[PDB]
Symmetry: D2
Subunit: 262 residues, 4 copies
Amino acid sequence: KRVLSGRVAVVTGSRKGIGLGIAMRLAMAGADVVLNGRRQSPEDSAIVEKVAAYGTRVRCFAANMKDRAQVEALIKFTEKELGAVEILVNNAGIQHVSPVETFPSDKWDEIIALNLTSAFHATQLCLPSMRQRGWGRIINIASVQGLVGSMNKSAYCAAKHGLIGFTKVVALETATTGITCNAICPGYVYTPLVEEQIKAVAEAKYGGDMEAATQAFLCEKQPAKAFVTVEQVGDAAVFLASPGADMIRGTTITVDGGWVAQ
Amino acid sequence: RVLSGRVAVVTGSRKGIGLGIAMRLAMAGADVVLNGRRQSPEDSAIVEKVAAYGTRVRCFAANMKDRAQVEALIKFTEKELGAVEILVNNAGIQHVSPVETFPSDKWDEIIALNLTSAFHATQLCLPSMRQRGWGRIINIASVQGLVGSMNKSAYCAAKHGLIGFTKVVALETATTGITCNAICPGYVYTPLVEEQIKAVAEAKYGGDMEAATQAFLCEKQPAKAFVTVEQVGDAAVFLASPGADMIRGTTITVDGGWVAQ
Amino acid sequence: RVLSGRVAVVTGSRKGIGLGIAMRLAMAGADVVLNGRRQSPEDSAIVEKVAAYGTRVRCFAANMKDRAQVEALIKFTEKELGAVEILVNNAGIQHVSPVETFPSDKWDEIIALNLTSAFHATQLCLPSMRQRGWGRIINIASVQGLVGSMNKSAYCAAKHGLIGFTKVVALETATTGITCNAICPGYVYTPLVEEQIKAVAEAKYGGDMEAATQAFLCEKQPAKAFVTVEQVGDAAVFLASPGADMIRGTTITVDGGWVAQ
Amino acid sequence: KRVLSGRVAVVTGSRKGIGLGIAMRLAMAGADVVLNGRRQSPEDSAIVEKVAAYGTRVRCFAANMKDRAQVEALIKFTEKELGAVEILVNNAGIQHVSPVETFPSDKWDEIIALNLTSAFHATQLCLPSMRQRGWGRIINIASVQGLVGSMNKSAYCAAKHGLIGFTKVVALETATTGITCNAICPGYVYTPLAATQAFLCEKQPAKAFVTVEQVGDAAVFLASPGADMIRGTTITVDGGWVAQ
């Protein structure tokens, strides 16, 4: 009765924020989902129950995406529990803000590895099964930062641009198959990552005024002056994984409220 | 059915992409107004095929170049069905020719139909959409609006301009419940592309349609397959959904990897 | 000099970006023909300035909307100086208005001047360039051809279309000695932009030109400074230089970072 | 006096091919140039003289750009011999053609490290001097693969896209200064690495190679005063590759 009934879905970094939203919207669309985190938490059961509220089979796994062996462990766990990985959502993404002059080298390395190389490892490990089964959906969670630049986000922008490029190459390498690769490029999304930013901006320039600080934060970059929701990102992912997008290959779905239209 | 009760208008939708977009909009539950240049004896059958999905579907004859007829269509839809909420500008005409010998008349026609008619329709529909607080404007551009192709100067220019207009409209309605976006299809199975492929087959491959079709596809589309009209309609339904509130001034490209290279 | 002996035609070069481009092309050794809609008493002075660089200079009054006058300009250049070897399509106008109340005549004029005139000039100039085996067709687009801006729907659509046309022309001539590239300036310190700034200062900042300029630049250009006409001319000279033989169908964006965000 | 007379430039990965062309065209413009290579070779002397043929001070340094310490050694050597680094051309890069399924992990890491992260290291080490002096040029030699995708070049395309994004961010971070950051995106260039016509005809509509000299010309344009307001953009020299 649902578009994605019987599809096995694996979302990296899906125990919080955008990844959790994508997992929720995929399970709502009828897909079994494997949530991924770094290490187990007492609330793992609560999150798993929240996603399972949609009637699909839901699993949880704690794999550090930086280690390729753990990525392979995640894929094999999904294959054993639910069957071949059919939808792969490369969402693992961290942020660090600093001018290029003072950007720590280890932080740059971590951002590049987690946002770019982890997607490479997961795609490499999942492609053979998708080719064997004649169907697949590689969805990379990029940002508007993958299309345009922003100050003090050199590592993030470079990683997301590279993720879009890798999306293009993977789409081209599978163009004559039942496997598509595409990227989602959200704008600002309300999350702890952004709530801490809003609180810091209130400390800096707005003196603890939440409403004005948030309004200015959005007015800077998003013309809509509104936050993109995790549900909207997940709905874009569901559209990408839907049959209607069988010929959507190597492109971007931009959910930004106008950020890259200027 | 994410579009129950929505009133939608599709321009140039008696055949090809517009027809499929109308069908897909009907499946979502939206009343749909088709359109073509002139009335046809085929109106009954086509409208019935679209109506098979249990939505109020009408047919109107208007010339999108003439703004008076666009106003007539908009008032027709406002009174027959209701206030226009989903506007689809599907432009059809195409003339292939090198720049040196491209007729001025056909260049003007291509720019006026692919670009100016969308501007007129958007200008006329925006007041009602701002009043109602909701609106979805979808411009059916092409991949030619993102990149260039030989002997398609007018078409590429018009589609690029359509994308630019999409961006400006989206920015001018950013804080409303009105979004404007564009869909960019590649080679799509339709009678017009079939005419192009027949020309190619007669010119280069001794009239063999299969060989000419493969040559046509492999030139630009890595997928080596046609984008179908149903996929364009699905993209239009995705954009027009209320869940696309924060999708503004962007392109949804359905081209089988064309623009990725 | 770099372009010594080349015959160049810059459209709309009686002031602003066009005059700067003419000056910088002549500084590179190129003969230049300036163009205006109406003959002006200042013509001679302008000529003198360009002629300060020692090349041959001419002036011609012809609105690019009329293709007949465009052909008159081309044949005038051929008579006086020789074959048109560089073609700078720069004639541009602006009309800031919301889409809802955008006048139809202004939209039509903007599309015609900013897009169709380039088409006519390129069409008339291409055959000679093909015969000679060398040519440069430099279209002066804007950042508005790459992104959208509120109340600039017509202008953005026209510049996007100009970029598409540049791509198609560059592709149709890829194997020849003719290149087609577009320049995308941001806010450029010219009389026109000063008029726009004065308008916004009177309407919004109580006549304070400093405040209006600060708001104008900070809204769009990260450099918080103007692009000079000399810089656009330098980009044009670079595109017309021999080093740019393999620069085809691309954009040289001079905007202080407008599109980088 | 020439347009770039008095400028001190460092071109990384410039022992051959694109980097050597860029260096020689910068020298033609009057700039002083420090070439860089992974390791010393006899050719070093020869190459140093070739650039030096244009009457500018030229030096050579052997330093693996994947190592930050060696990058800082290169920069400090240039400061020692010629002076502060005013022009920085991030050009070191390599290619490895393979499908994503069988792409060796170490090769992916090396391509990312040399095409993207070495640019970050060089820029980070050079920016303070350019800010204090108030003038700087950072030219990152990207590729058409930084703009579009190509089969069996996932690592390369990813690295070049990231390099372009880094260019945009740097340009934005230096917008109100005399420092511009821009990226050149060449197509197929005539380098050591009937078949020729088939090879070109697929990607370059011009059906002709791009020269290293043309890449150098684009770099000279970016480093000239006419480019003071060109920031965070791409100069694409590809014979029409990206126009389709």
